[PDB]
């Protein structure tokens, strides 16, 4: 009997004031939340943000919407949401969000007989995440989502995770190219501004960066160029054009590798781990070129000392480069 | 009782003309402003602007909204803001702005018994900022936000910072990788257009640019290439191919550094500090190449003079480069 359902729903919205919260003037209304993370699309060091798509569900009780005589959950057309009170929830650290609207607004309203309202949205949000790049690309980040009431203080509204630590689902299915999600955490607290105290829910993820792209992209080219620079020690010292060509080529390749590295990051003012490695490699290739300069300078009058310097450089440069690699990879792992 | 408050608000909005300002036809209405800065997302030299996110709070008194019998402040659902008069505040130097709208429009309305309205918005605005880059990257910028009334002249409306020097908070939340905030300033004045005189608030920040990134990525490569160009002085003058290769490589690499760096900025006509540094380094490397050219020209008939020239260049070039660096870094710091 749909006519009775229609009359009941018309009756529920008779004299209903959407300007007033449930239990207005009384104890705070409790809103429970849960989130299904559909995806985490892109994490950007350049923009210091990440994108996230989720099903966001809010739960509360409104006794003006209690009904009797219908033993069913009432799923209503989502436009009824424009005729009801809903919480004024927002994300503090977001930069641009939207509700999906194809084919219609991705919104859900479900009433229960006791007056309980389930309100669901599908949201894509870009959120700020300040990143510490001092150990990049061997770094680990902590990106959060902050959920707050905008207008209502803790005297009017309270937040809580519905189900405790089970309130956020779908994190374990997320696959990221550059990162892996070590852990996620749920926090509830209060935050005080000049206009009062507000409830706050926090959802945090810890992301660990994968190293393989950087092994293939920056570390191995640097190692190979540094090794290439050592071929000079095995060419006779009187071949000036050849050894100068080797030194120049290695220095140019070091600069090229560094520029391709820096073209993908924000302009932070401190030194990163990859920067440290690249300038170690640059010091090595520059020292090899200087070694040839010394040998070429002194070999006219002291051929034996020049031969000894070349012979010892055959051994010393690999040994010191191996030591530098050992120290670097032990200090950062 | 929710119905009593419901009828109180219904009485407040009964007979309310939204087309008229408070005290229309009488003394001007005073609007107090507060700004709580959440972040400055980015500062762009290419687009000559910056993006700011903030809580913008306006305070005024509308006697038509006074109510009695409820010793409480009514926090209303923000949709009621569509039924009230609000000031026509705009930002003169803004280029694109939006109010955040997830999950609802980030808007707040709070009424007080005597008729005071508190009206809050969460706004992200991209505001224009003309930058003088003559001292770049050692430059200091001043970026402002201009708050004005569009339609109402000073006879209708007045603006003031509510709280004086404490009207803007959250300046310590500004985390820019390439800048640091040195100072912020609040200004109140009037601006005369052909349609009358209008109140104007002004909020300005002084940005100091951090030099670390440019030291790491621009100055050091140039210094290292200039030093590499001096290795030619220590190589015997019979190695024409080796020394010519050294000089040519240094010259072309300096030109490449300058072009690549300048391509990433707006096409301003004047010379920046970094440009003057790069041009000095270019002069040094070009002079080293010219020195070898002269030595190669004269050494088959005057070998002693050529040897003396190389011997003196070894000492002279580092000394003059050190003097150039001392003068440059004293003038610009």
């Amino acid at each position: 009997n749909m006519s009775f359902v229609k009359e009941t729903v018309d009756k529920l919205l008779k004299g209903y004031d959407i300007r007033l919260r449930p239990d207005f003037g009384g104890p705070p209304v409790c809103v429970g939340m849960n989130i299904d993370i559909a995806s985490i699309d892109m994490v950007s060091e350049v923009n210091m943000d990440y994108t996230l798509t989720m099903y966001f569900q809010q739960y509360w009780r409104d006794k003006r919407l209690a009904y009797s005589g219908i033993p069913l959950n009432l799923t209503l057309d989502n436009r009824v949401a424009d005729q009801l009170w809903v919480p004024d929830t927002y994300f503090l650290n977001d930069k641009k969000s939207f509700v999906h609207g194809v084919t219609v607004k991705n919104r859900m309203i479900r009433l229960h007989p006791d007056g309980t309202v389930l309100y669901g949205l599908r949201i894509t949000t870009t959120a700020a995440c300040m990143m510490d790049l001092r150990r990049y690309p061997l770094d680990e980040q902590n990106c959060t989502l902050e959920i707050e009431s905008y207008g209502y203080t803790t005297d009017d509204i309270e937040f809580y995770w519905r189900g405790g630590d089970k309130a956020v689902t779908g994190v374990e299915r997320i696959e990221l190219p550059q990162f892996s999600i070590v852990e996620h955490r749920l926090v509830s607290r209060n935050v005080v501004f000049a206009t009062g105290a507000y409830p706050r829910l926090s959802l945090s993820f810890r992301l660990k960066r994968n190293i393989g792209y950087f092994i293939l992209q920056t570390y191995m080219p640097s190692i190979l160029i540094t090794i290439l620079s050592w071929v000079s020690f095995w060419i006779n010292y009187d071949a000036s054009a050849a050894r100068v060509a080797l030194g120049i080529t290695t220095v140019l390749t070091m600069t090229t590798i560094n520029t391709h590295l820096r073209e993908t990051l924000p302009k932070i003012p401190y030194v990163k781990a990859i920067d440290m490695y690249l300038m170690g490699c640059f010091v090595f290739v520059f020292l090899a070129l200087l070694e040839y300069a010394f040998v070429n300078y002194i070999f006219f009058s002291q051929p034996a000392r020049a031969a000894a310097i070349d012979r010892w450089s055959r051994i010393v440069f690999p040994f010191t480069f191996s030591l530098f690699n050992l120290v670097y990879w032990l200090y950062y792992v | 009782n929710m119905s009593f408050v419901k009828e109180t608000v219904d009485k407040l909005l009964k007979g309310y003309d939204i087309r008229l300002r408070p005290d229309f036809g009488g003394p001007p209405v005073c609007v107090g402003m507060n700004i709580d800065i959440a972040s400055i997302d980015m500062v762009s030299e290419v687009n000559m602007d910056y993006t700011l996110t903030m809580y913008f709070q306006q305070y005024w008194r509308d006697k038509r909204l006074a109510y009695s019998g409820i010793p409480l402040n009514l926090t209303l659902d923000n949709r009621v803001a569509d039924q009230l008069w609000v000031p026509d505040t705009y930002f003169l130097n803004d280029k694109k702005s939006f109010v955040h709208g997830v999950t609802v429009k980030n808007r707040m309305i709070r009424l007080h018994p005597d008729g005071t309205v508190l009206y809050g918005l969460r706004i992200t605005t991209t505001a224009a900022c003309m930058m003088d880059l003559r001292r770049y990257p050692l430059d200091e910028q001043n970026c402002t936000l201009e708050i004005e009334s569009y339609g109402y002249t000073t006879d209708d409306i007045e603006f003031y910072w509510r709280g004086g020097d404490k009207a803007v908070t959250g300046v310590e939340r500004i985390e820019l990788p390439q800048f640091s905030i040195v100072e912020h300033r609040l200004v109140s004045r009037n601006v005369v257009f052909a349609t009358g005189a209008y109140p104007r608030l002004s909020l300005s920040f002084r940005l100091k640019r951090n030099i670390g990134y440019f030291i790491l990525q621009t100055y050091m490569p140039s210094i290292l290439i200039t030093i590499l160009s001096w290795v030619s002085f220590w190589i015997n003058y019979d190695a024409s191919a080796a020394r010519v290769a050294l000089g040519i490589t240094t010259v072309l690499t300096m030109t490449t550094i300058n072009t690549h760096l300048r391509e990433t900025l707006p096409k301003i006509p004047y010379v920046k500090a970094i440009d003057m540094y790069l041009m000095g380094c270019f002069v040094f490397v070009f002079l080293a190449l010219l020195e070898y050219a002269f030595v190669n020209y004269i050494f088959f008939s005057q070998p002693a003079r050529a040897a003396a020239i190389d011997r003196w260049s070894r000492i002279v070039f580092p000394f003059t480069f050190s003097l150039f660096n001392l003068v440059y870094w004293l003038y610009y710091v």
Partner: nanobody
Amino acid sequence: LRLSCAASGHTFNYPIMGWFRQAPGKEREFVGAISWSGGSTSYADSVKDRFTISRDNAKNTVYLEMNNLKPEDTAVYYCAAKGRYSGGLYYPTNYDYWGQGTQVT
């Protein structure tokens, strides 16, 4: 007199250090706050031009120098860390990690 607050661990997640003092009969009172990186200080009215706050990231320290004392400056002093999205700068509730109390007469 000079109070030093040396912080270790995750100072990146808590980029702001603040100073508070508790009187025997009054609640905790905000004194000043310092940003670890930006070095942008903020002060309460009662200690403007008198107390100074400095930061050094070499060993992760923040210094409160107290000068021109008064008998109304006899309170147990605390240092605290504030999260990135923790709210207002003047409210003790928003600070998570609190240091040990220090007495001044």
